[PDB]
Each structure stands twice: as structure tokens, then as C-alpha cells.
């Protein structure tokens, strides 16, 4: 085996490149804790 590239005239596939847009970003990162001391801003402590 020998590794080469993909071409639209030897196969029908190419490299797929698209543009990144800042305002359409979604994060995938969940907080480990919530609502407890040490993990929230002072504005968000509800004094339960």
C-alpha cells in the first residue's frame, strides 16, 4: 500500500473546506456543577 490524495478526475471526491462563522457558534461543554459555592458568580447565588 502507498498513500496518495483524492482527486475529482481520478475519483469523484475532493477535499471539503467551508468557512467558519463566529456568530453561529455552538459550544459543547457542560458545567461540572451548578448552584453551589465555588461555581457561580455572586449575582447568581439565590440563597436557597
Amino acid at each position: 500500500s502507498v498513500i496518495t490524495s483524492v482527486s475529482p478526475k481520478t475519483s469523484n471526491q475532493d477535499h471539503m473546506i467551508e468557512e467558519f462563522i463566529e456568530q453561529a457558534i455552538v459550544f459543547n461543554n457542560q458545567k461540572l456543577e451548578s448552584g453551589v459555592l465555588g461555581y457561580e458568580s455572586l449575582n447568581d447565588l439565590e440563597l436557597g
Binding site: 465555588g38 457561580e40 458568580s41 455572586l42 449575582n43
Partner: protein
């Protein structure tokens, strides 16, 4: 003793995330009337322990009795034999000298 008002005020903001530490510095830096033995003005209904210091009329008083006591309405520093003060001993002694 470790921090001033302008240093403690620097840890508590709306856009700041708090923690256990901030409260350690808050508790250490203010006056703990139990652990430093100072209660301000005498009030009936309290409980005191050996060594407490209290301000009653124009004098500071330290409690002598070794067991806890309940501050009774009609027992007041000067009447009872729990409390003590030097500004009264010296006052009476100098009054005696003045009279003599």
C-alpha cells in the same frame, strides 16, 4: 487584622465568582466577640464565660467566676461579686486620700 475594608470590598463583585477562601479572609479579618473576649455593652439575658470584658457605666469589667453565668436583670456589674474593675478600686482609694 490581615485586611482592610478596601481590600475585602475587592473580592465581592457581581461579575466575580466566590469561594471558601474569601470567607476565610472575611472571618479572620473582623472581630469575633467570642474568641477575642469582648462583648461591648452589658445586656441582661446573655450568657458569659470566664474572662469576658464588658462596658458598663463609665467602666470596663472582667468576669471572675469560672463557670458560665446568666446575666440576670437585677444583677448588674457593680452590685454582684462576679465582675471586677480597677477604675472603681482606684477611684475609691483616691477618694479616700482626698478625704484624708
Amino acid at each position: 487584622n490581615l485586611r482592610k475594608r478596601n481590600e475585602l470590598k475587592s473580592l465581592f463583585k457581581n461579575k466575580s465568582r466566590l469561594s471558601e477562601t474569601y470567607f476565610v479572609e472575611l472571618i479572620d479579618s473582623t472581630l469575633n466577640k467570642r474568641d477575642d473576649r469582648f462583648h461591648g455593652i452589658w445586656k441582661p439575658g446573655q450568657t458569659y464565660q470566664k474572662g469576658d470584658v464588658v462596658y458598663y457605666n463609665h467602666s470596663l469589667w472582667e468576669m471572675q467566676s469560672e463557670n458560665e453565668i446568666c446575666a440576670k436583670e437585677e444583677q448588674t456589674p457593680g452590685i454582684s461579686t462576679d465582675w471586677k474593675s480597677l477604675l472603681k478600686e482606684l477611684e475609691q482609694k483616691v477618694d479616700k486620700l482626698q478625704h484624708e
